[PDB]
Amino acid sequence: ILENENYSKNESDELFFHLENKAKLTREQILVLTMSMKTSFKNKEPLDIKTRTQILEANSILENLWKLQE
């Protein structure tokens, strides 16, 4: 969700709703993502294609392994 270029425009409340709906969270976790998003997270440079490919490949096999364990 956080690397998606579509939400990255700005001033989109979509973020909080795809957090709550997509990757299950509770409000106390959304607030932490907001304030830590401000302190640490940095939108100045988007990631290189290399790390995006690697990341997607990892999310794939982690999601799939979790599905198998379930």
């Binding site: 909080f16 401000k38 302190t39």
Partner: protein
């Protein structure tokens, strides 16, 4: 009902402090060191 702040309001609140402390060029308070000058002078004032 859980917390009443909600993320969109916590955002507006947190940016204000972030910008205030960055504009003030404020260094965060560290953790008191094992070797510290004023430890004694802080204990006294505390304990009394």
């Amino acid at each position: 009902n859980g917390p009443e702040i909600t993320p969109e309001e916590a955002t507006t609140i947190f940016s204000v402090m972030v910008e205030w402390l960055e504009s003030r060029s404020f260094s965060p308070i560290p953790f008191p060191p094992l070797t510290y000058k004023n430890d004694t002078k802080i204990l006294v004032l505390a304990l009394e």
